[PDB]
Amino acid sequence: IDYKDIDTLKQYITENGKIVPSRITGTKARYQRQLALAIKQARYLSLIPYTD
Amino acid sequence: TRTVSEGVAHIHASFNNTIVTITDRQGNALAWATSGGQGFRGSRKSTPFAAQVAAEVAGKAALDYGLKNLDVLVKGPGPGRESAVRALGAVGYKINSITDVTPIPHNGCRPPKKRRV
Amino acid sequence: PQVKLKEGEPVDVAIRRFKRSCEKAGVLADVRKREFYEKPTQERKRKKAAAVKRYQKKLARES
Amino acid sequence: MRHYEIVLLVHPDQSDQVVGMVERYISQIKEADGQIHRLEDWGRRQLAYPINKIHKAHYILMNVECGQSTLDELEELFRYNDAIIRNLIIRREHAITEESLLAK
Amino acid sequence: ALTNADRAEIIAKFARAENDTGSPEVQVALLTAQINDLQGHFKAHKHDHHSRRGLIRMVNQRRKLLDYLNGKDHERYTALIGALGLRR
RNA sequence: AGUAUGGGAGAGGAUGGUAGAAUUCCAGGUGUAGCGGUGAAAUGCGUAGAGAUCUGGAGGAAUACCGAUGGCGAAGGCAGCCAUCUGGCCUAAUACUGACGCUGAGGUACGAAAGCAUGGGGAGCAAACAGGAUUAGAUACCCUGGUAGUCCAUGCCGUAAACGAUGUCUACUAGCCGUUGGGGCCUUUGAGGCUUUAGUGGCGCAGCUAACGCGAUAAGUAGACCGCCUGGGGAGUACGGUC
Numbered sequence: 001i002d003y004k005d006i007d008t009l010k011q012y013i014t015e016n017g018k019i020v021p022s023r024i025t026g027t028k029a030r031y032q033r034q035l036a037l038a039i040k041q042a043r044y045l046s047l048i049p050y051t052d
Numbered sequence: 053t054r055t056v057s058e059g060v061a062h063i064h065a066s067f068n069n070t071i072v073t074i075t076d077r078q079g080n081a082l083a084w085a086t087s088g089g090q091g092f093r094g095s096r097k098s099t100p101f102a103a104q105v106a107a108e109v110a111g112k113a114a115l116d117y118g119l120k121n122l123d124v125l126v127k128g129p130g131p132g133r134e135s136a137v138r139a140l141g142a143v144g145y146k147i148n149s150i151t152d153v154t155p156i157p158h159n160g161c162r163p164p165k166k167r168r169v
Numbered sequence: 170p171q172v173k174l175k176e177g178e179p180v181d182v183a184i185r186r187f188k189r190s191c192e193k194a195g196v197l198a199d200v201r202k203r204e205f206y207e208k209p210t211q212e213r214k215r216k217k218a219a220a221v222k223r224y225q226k227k228l229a230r231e232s
Numbered sequence: 233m234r235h236y237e238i239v240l241l242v243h244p245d246q247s248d249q250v251v252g253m254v255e256r257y258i259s260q261i262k263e264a265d266g267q268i269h270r271l272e273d274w275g276r277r278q279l280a281y282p283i284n285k286i287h288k289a290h291y292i293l294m295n296v297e298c299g300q301s302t303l304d305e306l307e308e309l310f311r312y313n314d315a316i317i318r319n320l321i322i323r324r325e326h327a328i329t330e331e332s333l334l335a336k
Numbered sequence: 337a338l339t340n341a342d343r344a345e346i347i348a349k350f351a352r353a354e355n356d357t358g359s360p361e362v363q364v365a366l367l368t369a370q371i372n373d374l375q376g377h378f379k380a381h382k383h384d385h386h387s388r389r390g391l392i393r394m395v396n397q398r399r400k401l402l403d404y405l406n407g408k409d410h411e412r413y414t415a416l417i418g419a420l421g422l423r424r
Numbered sequence: 425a426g427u428a429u430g431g432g433a434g435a436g437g438a439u440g441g442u443a444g445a446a447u448u449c450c451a452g453g454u455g456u457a458g459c460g461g462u463g464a465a466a467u468g469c470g471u472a473g474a475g476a477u478c479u480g481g482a483g484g485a486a487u488a489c490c491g492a493u494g495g496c497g498a499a500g501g502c503a504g505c506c507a508u509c510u511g512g513c514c515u516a517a518u519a520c521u522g523a524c525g526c527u528g529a530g531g532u533a534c535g536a537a538a539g540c541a542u543g544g545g546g547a548g549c550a551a552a553c554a555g556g557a558u559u560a561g562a563u564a565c566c567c568u569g570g571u572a573g574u575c576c577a578u579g580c581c582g583u584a585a586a587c588g589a590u591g592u593c594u595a596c597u598a599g600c601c602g603u604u605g606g607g608g609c610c611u612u613u614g615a616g617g618c619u620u621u622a623g624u625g626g627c628g629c630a631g632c633u634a635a636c637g638c639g640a641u642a643a644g645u646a647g648a649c650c651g652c653c654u655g656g657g658g659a660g661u662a663c664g665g666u667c
């Protein structure tokens with residue numbers, strides 16, 4: 001999971017842009033942490049929105 | 053004098069009062085009403101009825117500009133947020149969309165202290 | 170939310186759908202949370218209680 | 233020398249000057265010593281949110297191997313280059329040469 | 337941060353036998369090298385108390401090893417301190 | 425007990441930069457009567473135009489979601505993103521030293537918040553203080569404002585229900601169910617099932633306990649060293665000394 005895989009990043013983002021919890025999505029701890037980091041990087045680089 | 057076909061409606065709903073301001077696009081104001089201003093000046097300002105009356109009067113006032121379709125943005129908590137859109141529909145505006153715009157700080161400023169009542 | 174409305178959508182049903190979308194979003198609880206500042210010790214105690222309740226719920230379901 | 237990945241956003245009006253700036257940056261790495269493993273130009277893209285009232289920007293990504301000097305020199309070039317609007321530098325272990333998604 | 341080549345050179349200089357990496361001479365030489373290296377860092381960061389604890393641990397371990405070597409054989413201890421330039 | 429070499433996870437520490445949301449204030453546009461607050465009110469703000477909405481600007485402080493009897497650190501404690509310097513921990517095999525170890529009176533290092541000295545900064549919150557309410561009285565709880573402080577640099581201060589109310593180290597003593605970081609083995613439908621190790625949780629046999637309860641993370645069975653207590657008040661007080 002990288003910051004350049006916008007499709008898989010979107011698959012774990014709600015309509016409002018918030019990050020879905022692991023308990024709901026079904027992922028593991030390491031993947032969840034890596035993917036949160038990737039989402040933050042993409043938000044900074046403006047590939048994905050912060051909100052809305 | 054001015055004639056506009058489409059506009060926006062802003063509902064500032066709080067725990068003590070509800071303000072309904074109908075503006076044009078780009079945010080220039082056209083009409084505004086308040087639950088407390090439209091009578092019901094007491095603890096009843098926060099009741100849904102006052103919000104409905106405010107929305108009705110605001111819509112009737114704004115009808116002079118020939119607005120038929122409205123977009124609704126609702127801000128914050130408080131009873132009467134739902135009543136405003138119902139009153140707008142009753143007075144006859146066609147609601148294109150309804151959206152929520154309540155601000156959410158990302159752990160910014162420190163809020164006030166807890167009340168001990 | 171951005172609940173776009175169909176041509177024949179009634180206002181009441183539209184408002185019901187908007188309320189459902191807002192409930193799913195959870196903005197109201199976030200707004201409530203920031204009304205008063207809560208101290209870190211109280212927050213930690215609340216989270217501990219929540220975790221204790223959650224584990225008991227899981228065990229009860231498994232039983 | 234360590235491995236670095238650099239992503240740059242460029243103002244659209246200076247999109248024609250991107251070739252010169254990338255060429256100069258590459259020449260600096262090569263003359264210092266360095267090793268340039270990847271260089272991709274994603275092209276114009278609409279931003280998720282406006283930055284400085286700009287709604288579209290040109291994206292350029294590059295993977296290089298260099299030293300601390302070459303580095304701080306490149307960061308100060310990006311600092312003082314007006315065309316560059318936002319940059320991200322991530323350290324990496326070992327070099328990546330495979331074509332990346334969003335290439336074109 | 338000392339490198340693998342530097343550590344290997346130190347071990348080659350102070351090795352008493354082939355594949356000897358656990359002798360007091362080699363251990364004390366490596367500890368002395370790393371202690372000297374960290375001094376540069378600790379002027380640039382006077383308030384890195386968390387790392388200063390590891391530095392103090394290194395110093396204590398070097399002292400224990402030197403005491404053991406001195407107790408078991410004086411000539412080796414004197415030669416080691418002379419080569420490493422340490423007071424005691 | 426320690427050392428060399430390959431991998432792994434982490435809000436561990438220090439210095440610099442940077443990004444988004446929000447509050448406050450300042451100008452401009454639309455626009456005209458309330459806004460705000462409580463149990464109800466009132467003080468306060470507004471027709472030299474408030475509140476509401478839109479555009480632009482200034483500055484400070486903290487980093488939503490992820491987030492989790494999750495993680496790391498000797499303790500205190502550590503949360504956005506990126507770079508630089510840097511400590512510890514886990515994990516496989518081989519190869520080295522050969523008891524090099526445990527504890528620790530004095531001593532010494534670190535040590536939340538508040539407070540202190542110098543210089544800077546100050547959005548929001550807020551001791552003190554002022555006003556409006558409640559009450560028989562209100563020096564309070566409630567409401568409207570609001571200073572020190574909370575922030576930064578360099579030092580001092582040595583304190584907390586600084587708590588697991590449980591000093592450190594070592595060996596042994598039924599089982600069952602979670603979860604975090606690794607090692608190994610077996611199936612296939614690409615994710616599962618068994619083991620072992622180091623952490624972190626829920627039950628529970630024996631044993632222990634005045635009882636409550638603890639129970640391989642012991643308060644069980646044994647060893648080594650240290651600190652501490654001897655009815656309740658006077659009292660962590662006076663005198664003397666040190667800082």
Ligand SMILES: [Mg+2]
Pocket residue numbers: none
């Ligand atoms: Mg209040």
Ligand SMILES: [Mg+2]
Pocket residue numbers: 528
């Ligand atoms: Mg000791």
Ligand SMILES: [Mg+2]
Pocket residue numbers: none
């Ligand atoms: Mg007050």
Ligand SMILES: [Mg+2]
Pocket residue numbers: none
């Ligand atoms: Mg500092």
Ligand SMILES: [Mg+2]
Pocket residue numbers: none
């Ligand atoms: Mg004490």
Ligand SMILES: [Mg+2]
Pocket residue numbers: none
């Ligand atoms: Mg504590």
Ligand SMILES: [Mg+2]
Pocket residue numbers: none
């Ligand atoms: Mg005690």
Ligand SMILES: [Mg+2]
Pocket residue numbers: none
């Ligand atoms: Mg005293």
